[PDB]
mmCIF file of C-alpha atoms (C1' of nucleotides) and ligand atoms in Angstrom:
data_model
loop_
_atom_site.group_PDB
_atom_site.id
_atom_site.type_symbol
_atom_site.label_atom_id
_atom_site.label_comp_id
_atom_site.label_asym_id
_atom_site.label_seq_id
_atom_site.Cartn_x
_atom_site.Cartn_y
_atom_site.Cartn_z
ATOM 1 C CA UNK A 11 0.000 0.000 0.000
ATOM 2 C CA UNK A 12 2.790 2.230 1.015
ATOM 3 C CA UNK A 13 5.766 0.714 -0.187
ATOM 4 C CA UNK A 14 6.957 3.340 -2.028
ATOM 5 C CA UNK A 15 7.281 5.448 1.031
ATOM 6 C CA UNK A 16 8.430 2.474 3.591
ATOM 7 C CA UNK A 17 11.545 1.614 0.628
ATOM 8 C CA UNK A 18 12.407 5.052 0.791
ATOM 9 C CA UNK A 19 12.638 5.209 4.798
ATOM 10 C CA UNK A 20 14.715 1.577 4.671
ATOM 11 C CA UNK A 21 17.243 2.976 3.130
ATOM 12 C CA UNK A 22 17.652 5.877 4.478
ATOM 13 C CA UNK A 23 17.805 3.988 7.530
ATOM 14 C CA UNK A 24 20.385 1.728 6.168
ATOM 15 C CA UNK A 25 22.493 4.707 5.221
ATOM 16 C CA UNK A 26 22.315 6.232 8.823
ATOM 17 C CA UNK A 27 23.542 2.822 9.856
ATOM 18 C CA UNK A 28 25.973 1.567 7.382
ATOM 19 C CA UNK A 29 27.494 5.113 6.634
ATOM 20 C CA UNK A 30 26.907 8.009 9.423
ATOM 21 C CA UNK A 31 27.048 4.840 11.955
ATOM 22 C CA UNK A 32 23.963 6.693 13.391
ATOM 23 C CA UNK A 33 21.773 3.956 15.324
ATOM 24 C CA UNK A 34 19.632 6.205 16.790
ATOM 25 C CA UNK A 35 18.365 7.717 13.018
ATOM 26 C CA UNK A 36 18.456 3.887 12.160
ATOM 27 C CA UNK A 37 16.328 3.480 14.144
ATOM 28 C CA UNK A 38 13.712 6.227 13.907
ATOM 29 C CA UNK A 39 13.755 5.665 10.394
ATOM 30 C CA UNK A 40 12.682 1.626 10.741
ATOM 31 C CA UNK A 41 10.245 2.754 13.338
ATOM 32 C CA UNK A 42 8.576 4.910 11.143
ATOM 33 C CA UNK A 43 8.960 2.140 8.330
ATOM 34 C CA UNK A 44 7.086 0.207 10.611
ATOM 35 C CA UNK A 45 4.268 2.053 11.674
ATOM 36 C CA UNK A 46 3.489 3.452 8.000
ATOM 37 C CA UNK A 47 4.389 0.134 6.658
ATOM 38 C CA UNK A 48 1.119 -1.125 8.839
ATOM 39 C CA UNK A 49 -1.276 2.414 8.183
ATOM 40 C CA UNK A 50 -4.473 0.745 5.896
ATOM 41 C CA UNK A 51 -4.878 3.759 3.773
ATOM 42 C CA UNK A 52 -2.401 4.903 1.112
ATOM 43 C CA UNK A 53 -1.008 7.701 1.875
ATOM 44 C CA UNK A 54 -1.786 11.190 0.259
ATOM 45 C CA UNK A 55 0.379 13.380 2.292
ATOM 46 C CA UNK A 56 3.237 14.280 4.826
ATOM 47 C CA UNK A 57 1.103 15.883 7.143
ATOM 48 C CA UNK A 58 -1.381 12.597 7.279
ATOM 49 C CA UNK A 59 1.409 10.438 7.492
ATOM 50 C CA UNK A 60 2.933 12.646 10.308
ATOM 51 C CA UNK A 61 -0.332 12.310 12.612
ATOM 52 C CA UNK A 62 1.267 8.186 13.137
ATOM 53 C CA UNK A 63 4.041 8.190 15.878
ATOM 54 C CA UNK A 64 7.759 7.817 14.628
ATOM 55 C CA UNK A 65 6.702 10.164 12.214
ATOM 56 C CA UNK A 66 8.220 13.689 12.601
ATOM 57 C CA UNK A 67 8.726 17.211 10.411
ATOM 58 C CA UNK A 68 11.369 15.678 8.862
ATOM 59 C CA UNK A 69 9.887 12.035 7.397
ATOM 60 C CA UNK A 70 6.606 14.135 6.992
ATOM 61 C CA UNK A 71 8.610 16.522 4.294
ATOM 62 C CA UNK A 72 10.677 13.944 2.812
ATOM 63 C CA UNK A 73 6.987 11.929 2.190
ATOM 64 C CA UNK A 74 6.100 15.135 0.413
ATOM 65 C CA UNK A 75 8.683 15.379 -1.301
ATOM 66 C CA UNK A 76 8.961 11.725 -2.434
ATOM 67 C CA UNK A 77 4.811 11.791 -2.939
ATOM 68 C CA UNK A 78 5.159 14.753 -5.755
ATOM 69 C CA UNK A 79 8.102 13.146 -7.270
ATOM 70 C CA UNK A 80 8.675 9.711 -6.869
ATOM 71 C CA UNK A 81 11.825 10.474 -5.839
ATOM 72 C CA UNK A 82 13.906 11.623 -2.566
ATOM 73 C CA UNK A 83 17.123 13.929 -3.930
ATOM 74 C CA UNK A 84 18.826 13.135 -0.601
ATOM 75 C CA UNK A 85 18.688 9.487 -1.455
ATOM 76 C CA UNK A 86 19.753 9.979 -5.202
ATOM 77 C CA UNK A 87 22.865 11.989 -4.126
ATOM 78 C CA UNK A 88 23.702 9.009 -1.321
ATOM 79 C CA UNK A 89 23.049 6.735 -4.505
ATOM 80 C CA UNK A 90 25.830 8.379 -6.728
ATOM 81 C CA UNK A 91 28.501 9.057 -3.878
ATOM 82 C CA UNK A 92 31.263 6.249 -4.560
ATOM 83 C CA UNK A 93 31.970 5.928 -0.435
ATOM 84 C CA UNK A 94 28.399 5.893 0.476
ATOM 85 C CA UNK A 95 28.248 3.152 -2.065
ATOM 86 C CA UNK A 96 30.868 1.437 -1.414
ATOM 87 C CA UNK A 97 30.315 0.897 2.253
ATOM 88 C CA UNK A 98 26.749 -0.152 1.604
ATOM 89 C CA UNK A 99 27.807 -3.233 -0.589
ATOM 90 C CA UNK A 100 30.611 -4.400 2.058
ATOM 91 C CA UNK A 101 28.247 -4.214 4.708
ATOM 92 C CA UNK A 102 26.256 -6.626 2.922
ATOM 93 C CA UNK A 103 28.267 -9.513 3.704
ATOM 94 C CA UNK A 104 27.416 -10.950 7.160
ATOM 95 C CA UNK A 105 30.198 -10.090 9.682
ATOM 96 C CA UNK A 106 31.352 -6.831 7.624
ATOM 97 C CA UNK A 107 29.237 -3.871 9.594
ATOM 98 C CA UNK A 108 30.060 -0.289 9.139
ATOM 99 C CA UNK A 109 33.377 0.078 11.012
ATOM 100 C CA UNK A 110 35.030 -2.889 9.103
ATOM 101 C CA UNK A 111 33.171 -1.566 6.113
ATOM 102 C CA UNK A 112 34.835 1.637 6.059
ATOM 103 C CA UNK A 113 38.192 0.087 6.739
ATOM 104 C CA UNK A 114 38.343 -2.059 4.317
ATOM 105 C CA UNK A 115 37.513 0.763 1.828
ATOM 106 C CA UNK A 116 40.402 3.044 3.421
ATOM 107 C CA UNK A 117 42.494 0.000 2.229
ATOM 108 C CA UNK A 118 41.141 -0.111 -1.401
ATOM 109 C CA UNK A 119 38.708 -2.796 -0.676
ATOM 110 C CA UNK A 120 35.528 -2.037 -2.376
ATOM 111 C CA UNK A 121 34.184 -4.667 -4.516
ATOM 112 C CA UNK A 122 33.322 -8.628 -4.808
ATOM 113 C CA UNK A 123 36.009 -8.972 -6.686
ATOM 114 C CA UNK A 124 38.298 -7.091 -4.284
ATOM 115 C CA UNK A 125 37.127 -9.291 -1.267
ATOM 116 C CA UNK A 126 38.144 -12.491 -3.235
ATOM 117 C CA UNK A 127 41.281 -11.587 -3.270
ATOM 118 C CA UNK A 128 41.981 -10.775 0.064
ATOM 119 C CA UNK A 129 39.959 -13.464 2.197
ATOM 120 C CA UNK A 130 43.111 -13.342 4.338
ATOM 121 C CA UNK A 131 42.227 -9.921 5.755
ATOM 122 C CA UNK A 132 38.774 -11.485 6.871
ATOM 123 C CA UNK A 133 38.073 -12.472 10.532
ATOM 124 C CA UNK A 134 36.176 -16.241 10.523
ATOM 125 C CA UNK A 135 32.772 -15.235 10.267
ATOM 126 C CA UNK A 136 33.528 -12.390 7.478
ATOM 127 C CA UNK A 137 34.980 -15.575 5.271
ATOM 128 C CA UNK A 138 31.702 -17.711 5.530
ATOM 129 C CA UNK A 139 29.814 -14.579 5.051
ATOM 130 C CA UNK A 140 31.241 -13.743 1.619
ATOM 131 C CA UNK A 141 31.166 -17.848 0.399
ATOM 132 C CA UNK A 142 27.356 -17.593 0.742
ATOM 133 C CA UNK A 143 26.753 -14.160 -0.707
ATOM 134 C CA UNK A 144 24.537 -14.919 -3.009
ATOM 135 C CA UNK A 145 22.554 -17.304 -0.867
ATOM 136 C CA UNK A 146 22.112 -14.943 2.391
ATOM 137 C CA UNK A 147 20.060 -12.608 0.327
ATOM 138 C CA UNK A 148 17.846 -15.246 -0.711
ATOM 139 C CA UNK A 149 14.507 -15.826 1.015
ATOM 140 C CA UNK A 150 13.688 -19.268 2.521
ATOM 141 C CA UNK A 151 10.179 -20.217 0.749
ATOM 142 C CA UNK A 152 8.023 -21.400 3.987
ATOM 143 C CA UNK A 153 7.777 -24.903 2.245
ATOM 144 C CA UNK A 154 11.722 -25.211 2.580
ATOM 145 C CA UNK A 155 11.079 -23.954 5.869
ATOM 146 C CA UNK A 156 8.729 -27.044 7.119
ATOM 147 C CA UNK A 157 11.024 -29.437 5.350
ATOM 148 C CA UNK A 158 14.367 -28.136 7.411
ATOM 149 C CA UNK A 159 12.208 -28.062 10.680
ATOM 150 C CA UNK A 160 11.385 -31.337 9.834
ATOM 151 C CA UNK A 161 14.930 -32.078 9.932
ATOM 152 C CA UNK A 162 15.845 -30.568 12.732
ATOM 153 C CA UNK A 163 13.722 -31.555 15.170
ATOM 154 C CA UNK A 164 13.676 -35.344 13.879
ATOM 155 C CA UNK A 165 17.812 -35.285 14.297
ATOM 156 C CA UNK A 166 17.135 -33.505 17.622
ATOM 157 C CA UNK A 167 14.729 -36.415 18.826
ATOM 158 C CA UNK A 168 17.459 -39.141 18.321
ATOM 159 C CA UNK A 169 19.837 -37.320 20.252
ATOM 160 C CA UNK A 170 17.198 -36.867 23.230
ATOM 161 C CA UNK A 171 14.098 -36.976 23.313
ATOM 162 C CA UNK A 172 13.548 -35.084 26.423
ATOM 163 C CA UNK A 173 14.619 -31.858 24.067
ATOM 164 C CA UNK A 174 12.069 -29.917 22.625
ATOM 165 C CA UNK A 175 13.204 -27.577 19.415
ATOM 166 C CA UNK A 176 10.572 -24.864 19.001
ATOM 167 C CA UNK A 177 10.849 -22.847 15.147
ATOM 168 C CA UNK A 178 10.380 -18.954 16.022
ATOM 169 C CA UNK A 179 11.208 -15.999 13.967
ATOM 170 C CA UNK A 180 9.109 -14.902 10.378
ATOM 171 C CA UNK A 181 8.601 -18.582 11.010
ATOM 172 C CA UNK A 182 6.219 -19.085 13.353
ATOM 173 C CA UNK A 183 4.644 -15.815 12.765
ATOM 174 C CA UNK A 184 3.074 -17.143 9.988
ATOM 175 C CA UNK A 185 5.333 -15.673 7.343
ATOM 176 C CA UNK A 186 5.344 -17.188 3.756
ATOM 177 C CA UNK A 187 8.841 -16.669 3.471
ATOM 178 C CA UNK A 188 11.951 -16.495 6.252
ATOM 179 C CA UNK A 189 15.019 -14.787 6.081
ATOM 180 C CA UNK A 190 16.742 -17.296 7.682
ATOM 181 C CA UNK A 191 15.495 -20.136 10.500
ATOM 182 C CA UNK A 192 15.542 -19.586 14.129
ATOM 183 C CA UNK A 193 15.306 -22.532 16.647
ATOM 184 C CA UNK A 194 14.817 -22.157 20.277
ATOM 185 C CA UNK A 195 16.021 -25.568 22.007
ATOM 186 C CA UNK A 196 15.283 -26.801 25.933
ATOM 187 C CA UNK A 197 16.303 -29.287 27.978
ATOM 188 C CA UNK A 198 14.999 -30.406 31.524
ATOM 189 C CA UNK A 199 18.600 -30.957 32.467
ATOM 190 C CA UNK A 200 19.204 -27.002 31.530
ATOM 191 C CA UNK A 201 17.111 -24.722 33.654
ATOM 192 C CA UNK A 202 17.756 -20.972 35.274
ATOM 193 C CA UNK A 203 18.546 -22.972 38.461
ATOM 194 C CA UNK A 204 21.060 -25.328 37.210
ATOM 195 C CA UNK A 208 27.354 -29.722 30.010
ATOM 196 C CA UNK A 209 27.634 -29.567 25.953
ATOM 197 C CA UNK A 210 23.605 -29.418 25.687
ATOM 198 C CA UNK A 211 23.834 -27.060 22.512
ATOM 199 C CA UNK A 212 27.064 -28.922 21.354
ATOM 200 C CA UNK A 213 25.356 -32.325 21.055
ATOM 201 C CA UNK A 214 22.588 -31.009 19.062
ATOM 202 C CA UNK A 215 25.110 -29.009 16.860
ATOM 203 C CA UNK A 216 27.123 -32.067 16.377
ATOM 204 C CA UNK A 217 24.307 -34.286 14.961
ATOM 205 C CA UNK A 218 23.247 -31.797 12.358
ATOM 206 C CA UNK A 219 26.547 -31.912 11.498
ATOM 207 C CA UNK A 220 26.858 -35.258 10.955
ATOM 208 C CA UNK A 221 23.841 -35.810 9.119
ATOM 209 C CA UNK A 222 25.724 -33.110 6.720
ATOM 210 C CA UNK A 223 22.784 -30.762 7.501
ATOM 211 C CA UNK A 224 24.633 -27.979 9.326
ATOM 212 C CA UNK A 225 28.078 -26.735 6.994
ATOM 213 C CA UNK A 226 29.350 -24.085 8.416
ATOM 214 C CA UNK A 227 29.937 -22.267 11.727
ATOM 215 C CA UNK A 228 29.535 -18.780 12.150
ATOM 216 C CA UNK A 229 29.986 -18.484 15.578
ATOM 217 C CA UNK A 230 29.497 -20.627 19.260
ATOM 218 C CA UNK A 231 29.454 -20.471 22.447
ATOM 219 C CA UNK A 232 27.248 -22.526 25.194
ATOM 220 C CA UNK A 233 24.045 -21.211 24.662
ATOM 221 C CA UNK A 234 23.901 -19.848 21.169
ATOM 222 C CA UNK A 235 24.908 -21.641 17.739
ATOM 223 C CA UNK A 236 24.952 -19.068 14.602
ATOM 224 C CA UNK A 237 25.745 -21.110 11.378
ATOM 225 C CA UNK A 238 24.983 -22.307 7.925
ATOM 226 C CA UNK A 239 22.752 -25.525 6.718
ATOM 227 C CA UNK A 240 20.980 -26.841 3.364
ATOM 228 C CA UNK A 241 18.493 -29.057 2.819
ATOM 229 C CA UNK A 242 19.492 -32.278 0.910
ATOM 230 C CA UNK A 243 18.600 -32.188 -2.746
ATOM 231 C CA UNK A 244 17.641 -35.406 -4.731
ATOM 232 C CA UNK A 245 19.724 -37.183 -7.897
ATOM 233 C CA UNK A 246 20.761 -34.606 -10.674
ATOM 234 C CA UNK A 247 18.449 -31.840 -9.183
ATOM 235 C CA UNK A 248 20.648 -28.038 -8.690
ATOM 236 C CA UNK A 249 21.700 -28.004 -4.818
ATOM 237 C CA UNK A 250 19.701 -25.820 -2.594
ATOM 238 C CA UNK A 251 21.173 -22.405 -1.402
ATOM 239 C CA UNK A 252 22.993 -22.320 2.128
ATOM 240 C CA UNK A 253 20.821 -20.679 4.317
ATOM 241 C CA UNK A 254 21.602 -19.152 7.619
ATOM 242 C CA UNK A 255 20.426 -20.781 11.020
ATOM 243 C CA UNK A 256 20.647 -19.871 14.633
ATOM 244 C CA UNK A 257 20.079 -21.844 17.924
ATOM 245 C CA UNK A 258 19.715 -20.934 20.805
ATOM 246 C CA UNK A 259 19.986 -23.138 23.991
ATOM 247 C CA UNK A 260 17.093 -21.672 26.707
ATOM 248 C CA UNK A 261 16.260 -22.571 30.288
ATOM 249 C CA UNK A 262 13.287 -24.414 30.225
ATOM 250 C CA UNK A 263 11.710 -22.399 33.055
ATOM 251 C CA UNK A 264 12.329 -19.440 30.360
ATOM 252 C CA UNK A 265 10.391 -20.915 27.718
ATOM 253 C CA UNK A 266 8.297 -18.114 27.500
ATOM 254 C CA UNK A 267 10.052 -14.938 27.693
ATOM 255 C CA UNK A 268 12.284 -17.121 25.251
ATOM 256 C CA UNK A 269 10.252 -17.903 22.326
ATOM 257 C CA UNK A 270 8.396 -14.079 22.496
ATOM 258 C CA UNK A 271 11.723 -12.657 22.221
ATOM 259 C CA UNK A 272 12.808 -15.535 19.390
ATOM 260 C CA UNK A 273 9.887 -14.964 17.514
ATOM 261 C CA UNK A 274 10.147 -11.043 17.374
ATOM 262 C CA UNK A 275 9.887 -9.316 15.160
ATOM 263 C CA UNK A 276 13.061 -7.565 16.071
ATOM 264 C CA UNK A 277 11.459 -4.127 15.851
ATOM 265 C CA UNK A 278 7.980 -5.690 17.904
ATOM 266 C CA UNK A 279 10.197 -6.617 20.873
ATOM 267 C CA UNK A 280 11.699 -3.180 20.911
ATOM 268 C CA UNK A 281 8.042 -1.815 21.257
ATOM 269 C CA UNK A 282 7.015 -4.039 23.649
ATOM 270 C CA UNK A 283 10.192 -3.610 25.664
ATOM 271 C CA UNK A 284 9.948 0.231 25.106
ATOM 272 C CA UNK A 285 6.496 0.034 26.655
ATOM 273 C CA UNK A 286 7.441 -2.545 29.492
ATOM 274 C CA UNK A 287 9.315 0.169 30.425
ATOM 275 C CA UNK A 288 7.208 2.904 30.423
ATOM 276 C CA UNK A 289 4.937 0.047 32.290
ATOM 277 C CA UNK A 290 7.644 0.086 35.107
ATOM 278 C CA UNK A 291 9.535 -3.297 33.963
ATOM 279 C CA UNK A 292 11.861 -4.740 32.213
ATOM 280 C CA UNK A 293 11.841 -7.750 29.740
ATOM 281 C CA UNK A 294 14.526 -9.680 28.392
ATOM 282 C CA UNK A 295 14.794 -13.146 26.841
ATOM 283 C CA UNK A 296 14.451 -15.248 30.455
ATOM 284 C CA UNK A 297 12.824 -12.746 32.500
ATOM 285 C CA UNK A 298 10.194 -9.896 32.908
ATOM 286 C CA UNK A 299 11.245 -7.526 36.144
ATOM 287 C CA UNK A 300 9.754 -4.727 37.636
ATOM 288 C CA UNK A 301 11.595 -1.462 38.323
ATOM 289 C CA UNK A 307 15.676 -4.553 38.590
ATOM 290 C CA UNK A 308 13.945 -6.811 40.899
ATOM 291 C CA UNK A 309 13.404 -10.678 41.513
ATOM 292 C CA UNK A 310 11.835 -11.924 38.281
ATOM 293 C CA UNK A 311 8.167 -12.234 38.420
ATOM 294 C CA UNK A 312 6.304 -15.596 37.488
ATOM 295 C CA UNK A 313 5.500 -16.433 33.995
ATOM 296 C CA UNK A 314 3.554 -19.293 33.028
ATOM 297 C CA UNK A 315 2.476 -18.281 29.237
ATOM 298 C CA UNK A 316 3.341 -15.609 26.620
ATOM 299 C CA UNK A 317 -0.016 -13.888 27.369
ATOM 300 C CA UNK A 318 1.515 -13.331 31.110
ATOM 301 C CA UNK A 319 3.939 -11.242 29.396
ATOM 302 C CA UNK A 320 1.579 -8.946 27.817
ATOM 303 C CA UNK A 321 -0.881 -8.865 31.066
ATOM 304 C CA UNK A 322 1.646 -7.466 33.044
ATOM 305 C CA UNK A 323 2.501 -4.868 30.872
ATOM 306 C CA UNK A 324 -1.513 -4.008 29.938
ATOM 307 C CA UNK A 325 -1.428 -5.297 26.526
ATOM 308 C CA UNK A 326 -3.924 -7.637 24.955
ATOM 309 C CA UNK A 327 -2.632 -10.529 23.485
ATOM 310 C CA UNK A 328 -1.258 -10.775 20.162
ATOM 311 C CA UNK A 329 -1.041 -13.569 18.329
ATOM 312 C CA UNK A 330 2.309 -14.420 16.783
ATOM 313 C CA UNK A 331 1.228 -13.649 13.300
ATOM 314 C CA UNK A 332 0.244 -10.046 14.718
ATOM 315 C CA UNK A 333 3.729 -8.933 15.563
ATOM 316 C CA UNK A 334 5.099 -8.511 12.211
ATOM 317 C CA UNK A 335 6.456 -4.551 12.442
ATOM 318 C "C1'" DG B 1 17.542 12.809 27.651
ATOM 319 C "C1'" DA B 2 16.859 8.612 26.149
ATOM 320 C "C1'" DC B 3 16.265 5.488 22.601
ATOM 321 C "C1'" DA B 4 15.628 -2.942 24.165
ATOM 322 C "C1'" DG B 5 18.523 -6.102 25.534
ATOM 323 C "C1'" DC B 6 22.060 -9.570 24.999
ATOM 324 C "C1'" DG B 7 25.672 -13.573 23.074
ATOM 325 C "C1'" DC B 8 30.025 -14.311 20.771
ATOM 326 C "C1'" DA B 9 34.438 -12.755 18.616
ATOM 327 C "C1'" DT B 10 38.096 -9.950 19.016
ATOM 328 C "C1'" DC B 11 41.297 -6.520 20.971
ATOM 329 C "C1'" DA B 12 43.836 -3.719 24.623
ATOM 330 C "C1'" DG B 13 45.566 -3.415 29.006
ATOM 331 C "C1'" DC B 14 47.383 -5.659 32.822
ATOM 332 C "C1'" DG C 1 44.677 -15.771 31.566
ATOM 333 C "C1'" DC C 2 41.278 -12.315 33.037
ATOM 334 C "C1'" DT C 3 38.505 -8.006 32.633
ATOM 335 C "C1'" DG C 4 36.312 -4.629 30.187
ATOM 336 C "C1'" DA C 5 35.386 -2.240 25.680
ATOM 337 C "C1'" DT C 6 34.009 -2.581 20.997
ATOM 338 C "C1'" DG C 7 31.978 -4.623 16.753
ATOM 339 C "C1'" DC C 8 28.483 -7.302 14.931
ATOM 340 C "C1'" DG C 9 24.317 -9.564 14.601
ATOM 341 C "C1'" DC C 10 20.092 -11.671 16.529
ATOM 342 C "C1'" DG D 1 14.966 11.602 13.838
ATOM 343 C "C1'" DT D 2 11.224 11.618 17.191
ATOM 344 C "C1'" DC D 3 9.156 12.573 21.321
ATOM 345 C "C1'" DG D 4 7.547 12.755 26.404
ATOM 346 C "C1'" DG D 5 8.847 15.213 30.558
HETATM 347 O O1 DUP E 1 17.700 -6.756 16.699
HETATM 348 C C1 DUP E 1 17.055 -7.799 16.935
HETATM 349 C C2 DUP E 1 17.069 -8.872 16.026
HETATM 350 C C3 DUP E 1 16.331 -9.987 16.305
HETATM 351 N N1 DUP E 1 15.593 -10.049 17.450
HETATM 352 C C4 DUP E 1 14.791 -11.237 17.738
HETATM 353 C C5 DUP E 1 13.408 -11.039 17.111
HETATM 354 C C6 DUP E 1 13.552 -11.719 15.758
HETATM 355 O O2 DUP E 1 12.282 -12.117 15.212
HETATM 356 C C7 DUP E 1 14.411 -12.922 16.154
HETATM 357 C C8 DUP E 1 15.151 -13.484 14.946
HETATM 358 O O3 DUP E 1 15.842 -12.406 14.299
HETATM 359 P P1 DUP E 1 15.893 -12.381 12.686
HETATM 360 O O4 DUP E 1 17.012 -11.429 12.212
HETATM 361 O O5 DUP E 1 16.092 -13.764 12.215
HETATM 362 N N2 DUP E 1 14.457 -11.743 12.087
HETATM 363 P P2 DUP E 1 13.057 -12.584 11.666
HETATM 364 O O6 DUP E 1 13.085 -14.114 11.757
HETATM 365 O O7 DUP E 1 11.950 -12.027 12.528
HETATM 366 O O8 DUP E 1 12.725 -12.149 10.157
HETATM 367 P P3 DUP E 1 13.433 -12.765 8.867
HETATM 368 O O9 DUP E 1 12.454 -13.563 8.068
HETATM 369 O O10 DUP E 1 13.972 -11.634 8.022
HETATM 370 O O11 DUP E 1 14.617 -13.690 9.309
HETATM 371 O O12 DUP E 1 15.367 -12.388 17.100
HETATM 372 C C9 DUP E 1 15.583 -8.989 18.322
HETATM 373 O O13 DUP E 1 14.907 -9.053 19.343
HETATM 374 N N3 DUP E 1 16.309 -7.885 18.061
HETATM 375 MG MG1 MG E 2 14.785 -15.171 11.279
HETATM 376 NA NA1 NA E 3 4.103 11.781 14.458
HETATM 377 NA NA1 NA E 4 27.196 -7.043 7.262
HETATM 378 NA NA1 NA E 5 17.813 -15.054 12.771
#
DNA sequence: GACAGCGCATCAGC
DNA sequence: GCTGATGCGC
DNA sequence: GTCGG
């Protein structure tokens, strides 16, 4: 409906962040993305869209401006600047953010090309991140997406069957494509009370030559790289990306709201918690920190912090 | 003035 | 080696 | 860049 205005504000956003390394405008860009990006009417003008909150004097003019044009000059100028461009593509490859970005064009690093040649100047995670260029900007069709949770929680089974691997993310919001696939993975033995839980687990996918790479790991979160198995003489899938994340099965809850997001609903809701007088996190909601008060469902969340429920498939912003 | 909150990799200082 | 800061991404 | 105190 608006997606001519909510382009516009993504990368303007992604210019505060990649180039100015200003999170702040980063973020008051996405968050008026998001709230235009959700507005059932199509927008006619600035001042409309500046009556939604996120939306200031200066998104309202740059609507106006992009409304009677089609275009934003600001962004067309960003567009043409070699640097700005430059720093853009590098941070494109996962593990390259604006700092190294900017570094590695200081050193005459600026292209695909360029990067091949000099994998030796890239940290672990940089490397994986340029092999599967191509395939991190693809989107994960949601029928991929059953067939690798499928997977996953089958190979997860025959290593215990006391775990339970839970899909979150775009995922289990219902989305009809992911951008990569999030699992969220308890185990009685593992609880905020009281080894090589998330190991074990990694291992197996591993050996069942589901998991390929490793991005990065520690004891409770696994960042990494898997494809599905393709059939005789059929073209490979892409790599995708995958993250696990070992929780305390007391935490279940606070756990799989903040693993299914969205990234930019959890900062609302934790925004708001706030103003509520607490804090949330991924194990815990405190007031204001104190002792962590009881949580027996996701809706407990929300209750304490006067929201009615929403559904997963309701926090897509 | 504050902006959500945190895990892992990596570096500097000791 | 350990602690704390920074970068990066979820 | 936006906004509540
Ligand atoms: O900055 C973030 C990023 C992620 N998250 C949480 C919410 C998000 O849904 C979850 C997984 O992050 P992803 O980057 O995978 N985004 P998501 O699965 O929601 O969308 P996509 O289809 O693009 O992967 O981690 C945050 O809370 N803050
Ligand atoms: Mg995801
Ligand atoms: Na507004
Ligand atoms: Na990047
Ligand atoms: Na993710």
């Amino acid at each position: 409906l608006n997606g001519g205005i909510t382009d516009m504000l993504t990368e303007l956003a992604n210019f505060e962040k990649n180039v100015s390394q200003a999170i702040h405008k980063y973020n008051a860009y996405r968050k008026a993305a998001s709230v235009i990006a959700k507005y059932p009417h199509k927008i006619k003008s600035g001042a409309e869209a500046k009556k939604l909150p996120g939306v200031g004097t200066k998104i309202a003019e740059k609507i106006d401006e992009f409304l009677a044009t089609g275009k934003l000059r600001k962004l067309e100028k960003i567009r043409q600047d070699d640097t700005s461009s430059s720093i853009n593509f590098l941070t494109r490859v996962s593990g390259i953010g604006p700092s190294a970005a900017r570094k590695f064009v200081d050193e005459g690093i600026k292209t695909l090309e360029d990067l091949r040649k000099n994998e030796d100047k890239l940290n672990h995670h940089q490397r994986i991140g340029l092999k599967y260029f191509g395939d991190f900007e693809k989107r994960i069709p949601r029928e991929e997406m059953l067939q690798m949770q499928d997977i996953v929680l089958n190979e997860v089974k025959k290593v215990d069957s006391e775990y339970i691997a839970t899909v979150c993310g775009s995922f289990r919001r219902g989305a009809e494509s992911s951008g990569d696939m999030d699992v969220l993975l308890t185990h009685p033995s593992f609880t905020s009370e009281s080894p090589k839980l998330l190991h074990q687990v990694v291992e197996q996918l591993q050996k069942v030559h589901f998991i390929t790479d490793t991005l990065s790991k520690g004891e409770t979160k696994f960042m990494g790289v898997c494809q599905l198995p393709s059939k005789n003489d059929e073209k490979e899938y892409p790599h995708r990306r995958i993250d696990i994340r070992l929780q305390p099965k007391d935490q279940y809850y606070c756990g799989v709201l903040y693993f299914t997001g969205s990234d930019i609903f959890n900062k609302n809701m934790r925004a708001h918690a706030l103003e509520k007088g607490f804090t949330i996190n991924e194990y815990t909601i405190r007031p204001l920190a104190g002792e962590p008060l009881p949580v027996d469902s996701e809706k407990d969340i929300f209750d304490y912090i006067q929201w009615k429920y929403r559904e997963p498939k309701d926090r897509s912003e």
